[PDB]
Amino acid sequence: FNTELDELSKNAEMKLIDLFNKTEFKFIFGDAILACPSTQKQSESHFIYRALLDYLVTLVESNPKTKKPNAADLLVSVLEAATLLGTSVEQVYRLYQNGILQTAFRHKMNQRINPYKGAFFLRHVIEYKTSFGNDKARMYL
DNA sequence: GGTCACCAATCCTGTCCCTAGTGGCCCCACTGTGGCGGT
């Protein structure tokens, strides 16, 4: 699964019709987040889900925050955001309601967010998830 | 990234005229398109 996801990162710049900060995640990686088995049960994460996210944590690690956009500025939708947090979709809308998670362009007053349109950056959606500590994080070892 | 602030207001007092008048002349198309009983 790592080597399958490694070629998509190396050949990310090849596929670009627009800039990284304007392109969606499913345009480069393709369905690999919303196909993943859900963690609605117990808050017990799937071994497929543990392996996917732990690759994305080292992606933003290798792609620091510079003035040129890179692979860590790909746009993520509210459903793909809901899976990466492992919570309900209303709970992730409520974080948007109290401006905890910051969209990536301003909707103009009658814009209610399309649930499939890529709203948030991959970047700080991960950093929000690393603000919550669970036992098998890479920080301790 | 996107919109074009709310809260109330439209003035009262007086009047539109008087005089005189709307022309003469000539003309308004020829063709066709009838049924029925009788001497």
Side-chain angles (χ1 to χ4, degrees):
Chain A
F1 193 52
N2 280 6
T3 55
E4 190 166 344
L5 285 171
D6 281 316
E7 49 91 350
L8 294 172
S9 294
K10 289 179 290 189
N11 307 349
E13 193 113 60
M14 300 301 98
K15 287 175 197 172
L16 287 181
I17 63 176
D18 214 316
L19 329 177
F20 276 111
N21 53 317
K22 298 296 183 179
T23 51
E24 286 177 315
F25 194 79
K26 68 176 60 144
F27 184 80
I28 300 299
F29 285 95
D31 175 55
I33 305 221
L34 55 137
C36 190
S38 292
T39 177
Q40 85 294 346
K41 62 164 235 279
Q42 198 270 296
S43 195
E44 224 164 38
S45 349
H46 206 272
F47 82 97
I48 294 165
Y49 175 78
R50 280 162 188 165
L52 167 66
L53 148 102
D54 284 12
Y55 174 70
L56 296 179
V57 168
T58 190
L59 184 60
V60 302
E61 197 279 310
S62 59
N63 294 321
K65 292 89 188 194
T66 201
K67 209 95 151 177
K68 171 225 48 156
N70 54 45
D73 295 295
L74 291 172
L75 298 212
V76 170
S77 194
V78 255
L79 279 168
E80 282 120 270
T83 54
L84 285 170
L85 293 217
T87 54
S88 67
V89 99
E90 172 52 35
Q91 182 59 33
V92 106
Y93 291 147
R94 218 280 308 122
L95 291 180
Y96 171 80
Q97 228 315 114
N98 291 59
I100 306 298
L101 272 295
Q102 218 45 54
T103 157
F105 40 73
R106 236 306 146 239
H107 101 287
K108 248 13 292 266
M109 216 73 115
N110 268 345
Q111 216 289 315
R112 215 314 203 135
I113 355 177
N114 183 29
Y116 311 98
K117 193 212 131 323
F120 315 114
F121 291 99
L122 187 90
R123 202 175 283 293
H124 54 249
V125 128
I126 280 173
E127 272 92 84
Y128 186 72
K129 194 61 187 302
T130 65
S131 75
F132 292 81
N134 71 325
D135 305 350
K136 308 189 210 215
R138 298 185 176 183
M139 299 173 215
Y140 305 127
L141 193 65

PDB file of all heavy atoms in Angstrom, chain A residues 105-106 108, chain B residues 1-3:
ATOM      1  N   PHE A 105     -11.240  29.098   1.181  1.00  0.00           N
ATOM      2  CA  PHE A 105     -11.684  30.213   0.317  1.00  0.00           C
ATOM      3  C   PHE A 105     -12.987  30.725   0.904  1.00  0.00           C
ATOM      4  O   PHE A 105     -13.714  29.919   1.400  1.00  0.00           O
ATOM      5  CB  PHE A 105     -11.957  29.732  -1.093  1.00  0.00           C
ATOM      6  CG  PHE A 105     -12.638  28.408  -1.103  1.00  0.00           C
ATOM      7  CD1 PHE A 105     -13.958  28.301  -0.738  1.00  0.00           C
ATOM      8  CD2 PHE A 105     -11.946  27.275  -1.455  1.00  0.00           C
ATOM      9  CE1 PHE A 105     -14.593  27.079  -0.724  1.00  0.00           C
ATOM     10  CE2 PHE A 105     -12.582  26.055  -1.459  1.00  0.00           C
ATOM     11  CZ  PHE A 105     -13.898  25.963  -1.088  1.00  0.00           C
ATOM     12  N   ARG A 106     -13.301  32.008   0.811  1.00  0.00           N
ATOM     13  CA  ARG A 106     -14.540  32.409   1.513  1.00  0.00           C
ATOM     14  C   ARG A 106     -15.785  32.286   0.648  1.00  0.00           C
ATOM     15  O   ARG A 106     -15.849  32.901  -0.384  1.00  0.00           O
ATOM     16  CB  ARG A 106     -14.413  33.767   2.195  1.00  0.00           C
ATOM     17  CG  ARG A 106     -14.716  33.708   3.684  1.00  0.00           C
ATOM     18  CD  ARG A 106     -16.073  33.073   3.901  1.00  0.00           C
ATOM     19  NE  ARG A 106     -16.268  32.256   5.094  1.00  0.00           N
ATOM     20  CZ  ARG A 106     -16.621  30.968   5.111  1.00  0.00           C
ATOM     21  NH1 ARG A 106     -16.806  30.305   3.982  1.00  0.00           N
ATOM     22  NH2 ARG A 106     -16.781  30.345   6.268  1.00  0.00           N
ATOM     23  N   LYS A 108     -19.520  33.171  -0.366  1.00  0.00           N
ATOM     24  CA  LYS A 108     -20.100  34.522  -0.133  1.00  0.00           C
ATOM     25  C   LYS A 108     -21.580  34.455   0.285  1.00  0.00           C
ATOM     26  O   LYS A 108     -22.450  34.226  -0.557  1.00  0.00           O
ATOM     27  CB  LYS A 108     -19.531  35.585  -1.080  1.00  0.00           C
ATOM     28  CG  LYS A 108     -18.655  36.662  -0.422  1.00  0.00           C
ATOM     29  CD  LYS A 108     -18.151  36.452   1.033  1.00  0.00           C
ATOM     30  CE  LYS A 108     -19.169  36.470   2.161  1.00  0.00           C
ATOM     31  NZ  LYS A 108     -19.308  37.804   2.780  1.00  0.00           N
TER      32      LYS A 108
ATOM     33  P    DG B   1      -9.847  32.481  -2.092  1.00  0.00           P
ATOM     34  OP1  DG B   1      -9.337  32.761  -3.459  1.00  0.00           O
ATOM     35  OP2  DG B   1      -9.323  33.260  -0.942  1.00  0.00           O
ATOM     36  O5'  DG B   1     -11.432  32.640  -2.123  1.00  0.00           O
ATOM     37  C5'  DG B   1     -12.269  32.057  -1.101  1.00  0.00           C
ATOM     38  C4'  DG B   1     -13.366  33.012  -0.685  1.00  0.00           C
ATOM     39  O4'  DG B   1     -12.908  33.806   0.431  1.00  0.00           O
ATOM     40  C3'  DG B   1     -13.836  33.995  -1.759  1.00  0.00           C
ATOM     41  O3'  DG B   1     -15.043  33.455  -2.315  1.00  0.00           O
ATOM     42  C2'  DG B   1     -14.075  35.289  -0.999  1.00  0.00           C
ATOM     43  C1'  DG B   1     -13.224  35.179   0.259  1.00  0.00           C
ATOM     44  N9   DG B   1     -11.971  35.927   0.319  1.00  0.00           N
ATOM     45  C8   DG B   1     -11.365  36.677  -0.661  1.00  0.00           C
ATOM     46  N7   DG B   1     -10.233  37.203  -0.276  1.00  0.00           N
ATOM     47  C5   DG B   1     -10.080  36.769   1.034  1.00  0.00           C
ATOM     48  C6   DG B   1      -9.041  37.015   1.972  1.00  0.00           C
ATOM     49  O6   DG B   1      -8.013  37.688   1.826  1.00  0.00           O
ATOM     50  N1   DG B   1      -9.285  36.379   3.186  1.00  0.00           N
ATOM     51  C2   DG B   1     -10.386  35.604   3.464  1.00  0.00           C
ATOM     52  N2   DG B   1     -10.445  35.073   4.695  1.00  0.00           N
ATOM     53  N3   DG B   1     -11.360  35.368   2.599  1.00  0.00           N
ATOM     54  C4   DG B   1     -11.143  35.978   1.414  1.00  0.00           C
ATOM     55  P    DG B   2     -15.830  34.217  -3.484  1.00  0.00           P
ATOM     56  OP1  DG B   2     -16.801  33.265  -4.080  1.00  0.00           O
ATOM     57  OP2  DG B   2     -14.833  34.891  -4.353  1.00  0.00           O
ATOM     58  O5'  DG B   2     -16.653  35.333  -2.702  1.00  0.00           O
ATOM     59  C5'  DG B   2     -17.557  35.011  -1.622  1.00  0.00           C
ATOM     60  C4'  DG B   2     -17.974  36.285  -0.924  1.00  0.00           C
ATOM     61  O4'  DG B   2     -16.808  36.930  -0.368  1.00  0.00           O
ATOM     62  C3'  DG B   2     -18.636  37.300  -1.856  1.00  0.00           C
ATOM     63  O3'  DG B   2     -20.055  37.157  -1.686  1.00  0.00           O
ATOM     64  C2'  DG B   2     -18.081  38.645  -1.415  1.00  0.00           C
ATOM     65  C1'  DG B   2     -16.873  38.337  -0.525  1.00  0.00           C
ATOM     66  N9   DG B   2     -15.574  38.798  -1.002  1.00  0.00           N
ATOM     67  C8   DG B   2     -15.174  38.937  -2.310  1.00  0.00           C
ATOM     68  N7   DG B   2     -13.953  39.379  -2.427  1.00  0.00           N
ATOM     69  C5   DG B   2     -13.516  39.538  -1.119  1.00  0.00           C
ATOM     70  C6   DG B   2     -12.271  39.987  -0.619  1.00  0.00           C
ATOM     71  O6   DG B   2     -11.276  40.344  -1.253  1.00  0.00           O
ATOM     72  N1   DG B   2     -12.247  39.993   0.772  1.00  0.00           N
ATOM     73  C2   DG B   2     -13.293  39.617   1.580  1.00  0.00           C
ATOM     74  N2   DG B   2     -13.081  39.697   2.902  1.00  0.00           N
ATOM     75  N3   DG B   2     -14.464  39.197   1.124  1.00  0.00           N
ATOM     76  C4   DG B   2     -14.504  39.183  -0.227  1.00  0.00           C
ATOM     77  P    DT B   3     -21.101  37.794  -2.724  1.00  0.00           P
ATOM     78  OP1  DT B   3     -22.313  36.935  -2.736  1.00  0.00           O
ATOM     79  OP2  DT B   3     -20.387  38.072  -3.997  1.00  0.00           O
ATOM     80  O5'  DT B   3     -21.482  39.188  -2.051  1.00  0.00           O
ATOM     81  C5'  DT B   3     -22.517  39.321  -1.053  1.00  0.00           C
ATOM     82  C4'  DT B   3     -22.210  40.483  -0.134  1.00  0.00           C
ATOM     83  O4'  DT B   3     -20.781  40.680  -0.083  1.00  0.00           O
ATOM     84  C3'  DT B   3     -22.819  41.814  -0.571  1.00  0.00           C
ATOM     85  O3'  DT B   3     -23.917  42.109   0.304  1.00  0.00           O
ATOM     86  C2'  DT B   3     -21.723  42.842  -0.342  1.00  0.00           C
ATOM     87  C1'  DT B   3     -20.438  42.053  -0.137  1.00  0.00           C
ATOM     88  N1   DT B   3     -19.395  42.222  -1.171  1.00  0.00           N
ATOM     89  C2   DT B   3     -18.280  42.967  -0.855  1.00  0.00           C
ATOM     90  O2   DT B   3     -18.128  43.518   0.225  1.00  0.00           O
ATOM     91  N3   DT B   3     -17.352  43.061  -1.861  1.00  0.00           N
ATOM     92  C4   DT B   3     -17.416  42.483  -3.116  1.00  0.00           C
ATOM     93  O4   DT B   3     -16.498  42.652  -3.915  1.00  0.00           O
ATOM     94  C5   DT B   3     -18.604  41.702  -3.374  1.00  0.00           C
ATOM     95  C7   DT B   3     -18.761  41.036  -4.705  1.00  0.00           C
ATOM     96  C6   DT B   3     -19.520  41.609  -2.402  1.00  0.00           C
TER      97       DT B   3
END
